[PDB]
Structure 1
Amino acid sequence: KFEVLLGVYTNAIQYVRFLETALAVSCVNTEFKDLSRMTDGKIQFRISV
């Protein structure tokens, strides 16, 4: 008289990625990373309408 283990299972965690989703349509990913290095967190624009 036995006790069957009918199988054993785990789920695959899906790899979400920020550049795979379409939320990155509304964001441009700059490869500059100097605004983390910059002390003040401001950037000044000379716009001209």
Structure 2
Amino acid sequence: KFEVLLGVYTNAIQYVRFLETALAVSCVNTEFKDLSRMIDGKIQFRISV
């Protein structure tokens, strides 16, 4: 008996981008090429009550 194979198939490793999904409504994005030189990001509010 000759053992005939019928094809070597593979899983399609799909690209999944974070901006591609709709989870990126729950944040806004910003490309930062040197994030690791930041040690401490500080934001500030002022509430005139």
User: Is TM > 0.5 for Structure 1 vs Structure 2?
Assistant: yes
| Segment drifting more, 26-35 vs 7-16 | 26-35
Q: Which has the higher helix share?
A: 2
| Segment drifting more, 28-37 vs 39-48 | 28-37
Report the CA distance between 1:16 and its aligned residue: 0.8
> How much identity, in percent, do the aligned residues show?
98
2 CA distance for matches of 1:43 and 1:34?
18
Report the CA distance between 1:20 and its aligned residue: 0.4
Q: 1:33 to 1:42 in 2, by over 3 A?
A: farther
Deviation by residue 1:2-43 (Cα, 9 ceiling, x = unmatched): 111121111111111100000001111134678754433432
Number of positions where the alignment pairs a residue of Structure 1 with one of Structure 2: 49
> Stretches of 4+ moved more than 6 A in 1?
none
2 CA distance for matches of 1:29 and 1:16?
16
Tell me how large the CA RMSD over aligned residues is: 2.7
2:11: which partner in 1? Answer: 11
Report the CA distance between 1:47 and its aligned residue: 3.1
